Amino acid sequence: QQEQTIAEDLVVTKYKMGGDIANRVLRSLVEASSSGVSVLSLCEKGDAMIMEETGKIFKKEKEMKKGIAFPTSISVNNCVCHFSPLKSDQDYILKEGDLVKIDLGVHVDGFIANVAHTFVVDVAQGTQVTGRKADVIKAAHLCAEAALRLVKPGNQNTQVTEAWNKVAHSFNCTPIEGMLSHQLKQHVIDGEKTIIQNPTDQQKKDHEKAEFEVHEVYAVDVLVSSGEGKAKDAGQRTTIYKRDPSKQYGLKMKTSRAFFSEVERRFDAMPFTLRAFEKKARMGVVECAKHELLQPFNVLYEKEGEFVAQFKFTVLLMPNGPMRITSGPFEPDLYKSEMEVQDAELKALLQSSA
């Protein structure tokens, strides 16, 4: 009963302002991406820009929390998600032709605006991206377009799941199995109401069918692969975590207890990167993650040589229709695929207005 929702104009404003910041920071990072650029540097730049820009709004409200909802993550080629290296980790240096996914989130007073975008590094003027890179990027963006049209009051999450499989297969691509798009609420990045990608038979049973409703907010997250779509851990150090306020445990080590306290104060229940702490965080993390006080956002990979594309946007289900508050700077004429959507209903859906 105490929820602040988009029925309130002020709440819509807070979402829109966080969305404007997310959009601006994303575009800055895309422009800063060129051959030879350090992924660590881009992650640090993104996060700092989020803090600086949120610092400049609602200045008179000195107690209002605002800042990072999802730390800047830059996941290249077959890397799926959540790459945000520690200073001590192996960095990654961008190469011409790399496929890059930038994923980040901003919050204003707990209202979250998440965005992610895919592009290719240093595409030359007057050329197009072709091949499997083009296939997977076009597939992922058409999945995003389909979701923009289908995530509306009265529709079912299952409709989205089905459309995504049809679109992706049109390009001989596969949405990554089991990945979720969450409803957002104030202070809640991971609402239990979700859209699931390409669920296994077991995932279909464990996942709840649901109907979208007016005043709900979603961070729609499309991740599509040129390969089988069964993402796996590959020994990469997890750096992104979130506190889970539903779980409690009295920690045995003073370092763990103090780390717990610092996490709660600084981040509440927003995902954060360990780079925000490096040694003393590493030990505190161990006990907290072990007893489920922190949830990891692991770095997952598709098969070597394959490509994973992503588009994520946040949408407000307003009485007058869906209102998207974030998006990436997608240029369709850049991508040429041998394939196209052939399905009549799907083609109709994609040509219709959003």
From Swiss-Prot:
Superkingdom to which the source organism belongs: Eukaryota
Necessary for nucleolar localization: annotated span: 1-42, 293-354
Protein name: Proliferation-associated protein 2G4
Entries under Pfam families matching the protein: Peptidase_M24
Location of the region described as RNA-binding in the Swiss-Prot/TrEMBL record: 40-48
Covalent link (Glycyl lysine isopeptide (Lys-Gly) (interchain with G-Cter in SUMO2)) residue numbers: K290
Effect in UniProt of substituting S353D: No effect on phosphorylation and loss of nucleolar localization
PTM per Swiss-Prot/TrEMBL: Phosphorylated on serine and threonine residues. Phosphorylation is enhanced by HRG treatment. Basal phosphorylation is PKC-dependent and HRG-induced phosphorylation is predominantly PKC-independent. Phosphorylation at Ser-353 by PKC/PRKCD regulates its nucleolar localization. In cancer cells, isoform 2 is polyubiquitinated leading to its proteasomal degradation and phosphorylation by PKC/PRKCD enhances polyubiquitination.
Gene Ontology biological process terms in this record: negative regulation of apoptotic process; negative regulation of DNA-templated transcription; positive regulation of cell differentiation; regulation of translation; rRNA processing
Role played: May play a role in a ERBB3-regulated signal transduction pathway. Seems be involved in growth regulation. Acts a corepressor of the androgen receptor (AR) and is regulated by the ERBB3 ligand neuregulin-1/heregulin (HRG). Inhibits transcription of some E2F1-regulated promoters, probably by recruiting histone acetylase (HAT) activity. Binds RNA. Associates with 28S, 18S and 5.8S mature rRNAs, several rRNA precursors and probably U3 small nucleolar RNA. May be involved in regulation of intermediate and late steps of rRNA processing. May be involved in ribosome assembly.
GO CC annotations, alphabetized: azurophil granule lumen; cytoplasm; extracellular exosome; extracellular region; membrane; nucleolus; nucleus; ribonucleoprotein complex
Keywords noted in UniProt: Acetylation, Cytoplasm, Isopeptide bond, Nucleus, Phosphoprotein, Repressor, Ribonucleoprotein, RNA-binding, rRNA processing, Transcription, Transcription regulation, Translation regulation, Ubl conjugation
Taxonomic lineage from the root: Eukaryota, Metazoa, Chordata, Craniata, Vertebrata
Modified residues (Phosphoserine): S327, S353
Quaternary state and interactors: Isoform 2 interacts with the cytoplasmic domain of non-phosphorylated ERBB3; the interaction requires PKC activity. Interacts with AR. Treatment with HRG leads to dissociation from ERBB3 and increases association with AR. Interacts with NCL/nucleolin. Component of a ribonucleoprotein complex containing at least PA2G4, NCL, TOP1, PABPC2, RPLP0, acetylated histone H1 (HIST1H1A or H1F1), histone H1 2/4, RPL4, RPL8, RPL15, RPL18, RPL18A, RPL21, RPL11, RPL12, RPL28, RPL27, RPLP2 and RPL24. Interacts with HDAC2. Interacts with RB1; the interaction is enhanced upon PA2G4 dephosphorylation.
Listed NCBIfam families: crvDNA_42K (TIGR00495)
GO molecular function: nucleic acid binding; RNA binding; transcription corepressor activity; ubiquitin protein ligase binding
Similarity remark: Belongs to the peptidase M24 family.
SUPFAM superfamilies: Creatinase/aminopeptidase, Winged helix' DNA-binding domain
InterPro entries in UniProt: Creatinase/aminopeptidase-like (IPR036005), PA2G4 (IPR004545), PA2G4/ARX1 (IPR047113), Pept_M24 (IPR000994), Pept_M24A_MAP2_BS (IPR018349), WH-like_DNA-bd_sf (IPR036388), WH_DNA-bd_sf (IPR036390)
Tissue/organ expression: Isoform 2 is undetectable whereas isoform 1 is strongly expressed in cancer cells (at protein level). Isoform 1 and isoform 2 are widely expressed, including heart, brain, lung, pancreas, skeletal muscle, kidney, placenta and liver.
PANTHER family hit by this protein: PROLIFERATION-ASSOCIATED PROTEIN 2G4 (PTHR10804:SF11), PROTEASE FAMILY M24 METHIONYL AMINOPEPTIDASE, AMINOPEPTIDASE P (PTHR10804)
